[PDB]
């Protein structure tokens, strides 16, 4: 049934705006993602404790970004994507250079979510 | 004695040129300095284990830089200074934004060595 999914998005968007009022709409969702961060000093990947549902969102300023509602702690992840060149697809991961030059690695539990979300990110920044 | 410094200055410049041939002259010297580096992401200062005598040098191309002859290991530090704005003085320390965007902290044992060299940096 269709009406459920409009109601699912309505609850989802109300929650996202409760944490981040400037959010305007949900472009796409990924059921579960794990977050990694690359330490430029050790030059190795490290695992963060940020894990949960991934929401691709557009804010009032038309910027593209994603929120991850962490299932392990109240500390969520909200990062904008400013440029196509700053997001790559390598093997099973999304690697993202943030505005502050940090390097994030996204692993999606569903591989089909990885490929769909990465192409919708291309179509959103153009 | 003036003859004393003629051989001391001669040996110092002779040593610097052995590690860094482009070195042309020594502008000033600091007896002992410790080097710190700020870790991005970690948002902390780190101990660099580079410690020793500080040589402010002028380059073959007339560039300004400083060499620190490490007393703990053969790993020296040679960093150029591009602009007075790239070195600030904050609470007895010199903080230097290097060419590669790294930020180093210089600690001098003599504050008169500290501020004296910092005024020499503000020129050139």
């Amino acid at each position: 049934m269709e009406d459920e999914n409009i109601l699912r998005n309505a609850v989802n968007l109300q929650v996202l705006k409760f944490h981040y009022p400037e959010i305007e709409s949900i472009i796409d969702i990924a059921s579960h993602v794990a977050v990694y961060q690359f330490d430029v000093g050790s030059q190795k990947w490290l695992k963060t404790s940020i894990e949960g549902t991934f929401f691709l969102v557009k804010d009032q300023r038309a910027r593209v970004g994603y929120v991850i509602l962490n299932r392990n702690s109240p500390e969520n992840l909200y990062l904008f994507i400013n440029h196509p060149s700053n997001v790559h697809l390598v093997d099973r991961y999304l690697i993202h250079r943030t505005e502050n030059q940090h390097v994030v690695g996204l692993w999606m539990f569903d591989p089909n979510d990885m490929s769909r979300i990465f192409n919708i990110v291309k179509e959103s920044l153009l | 004695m003036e003859d004393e410094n003629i051989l001391r200055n001669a040996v110092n410049l002779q040593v610097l040129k052995f590690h860094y041939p482009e070195i042309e002259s020594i502008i000033d010297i600091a007896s002992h300095v410790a080097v710190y580096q700020f870790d991005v992401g970690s948002q902390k200062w780190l101990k660099t284990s580079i410690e020793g005598t500080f040589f402010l040098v002028k380059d073959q191309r007339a560039r300004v830089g400083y060499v620190i002859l490490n007393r703990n290991s053969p790993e020296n530090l040679y960093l150029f200074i591009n602009h007075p704005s790239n070195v600030h003085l904050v609470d007895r320390y010199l903080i230097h934004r290097t060419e590669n965007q790294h930020v180093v902290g210089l600690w001098m044992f003599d504050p008169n060595d500290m501020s004296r060299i910092f005024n020499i940096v503000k020129e050139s």
Binding site: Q37, T98, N100, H102 | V40, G41, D91, Y93
Partner: peptide, 23 residues
């Protein structure tokens, strides 16, 4: 004597250092 610990070092200029990873 020995050099001060890195903890006493003052914070660098705000505009020379990038922000933390997450706000």
């Amino acid at each position: 004597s020995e050099p001060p610990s890195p903890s006493v070092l003052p914070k660098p200029p705000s505009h020379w250092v990038p922000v933390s990873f997450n706000p």
